[PDB]
């Protein structure tokens with residue numbers, strides 16, 4: 001897990017940026033925020049894939065992928081771990 005704090009900040013900042021993301025239990029299943037799994041996922045995959053040019057086929061989309069931030073961290077780290085100071089819309 002590299003820059004794991006950025007991953008929580010990346011997802012948490014999108015939902016609650018007025019709250020310190022490092023002060024949020026990053027152990028919460030993003031499923032509650034599943035709102036991003038469909039509407040945000042379409043925008044994130046289209047924008048995120050374009051930014052790194054990663055084909056969606058490389059990874060399958062499913063609710064289990066958002067079950068926990070740690071699970072996603074492994075898939076992202078296994079392919080690419082891009083650290084960012086803040087989430088870009």
Ligand SMILES: *P(=O)(O)OCC(C)(C)[C@H](O)C(=O)NCCC(=O)NCCS
Nearest residue numbers: 034035036037038039041042061062063
């Ligand atoms: P949302 O809560 O409608 O997304 C829920 C899940 C993740 C179950 C979604 O239906 C799914 O099967 N996975 C992602 C599908 C997808 O490509 N989303 C973009 C347009 S819905």
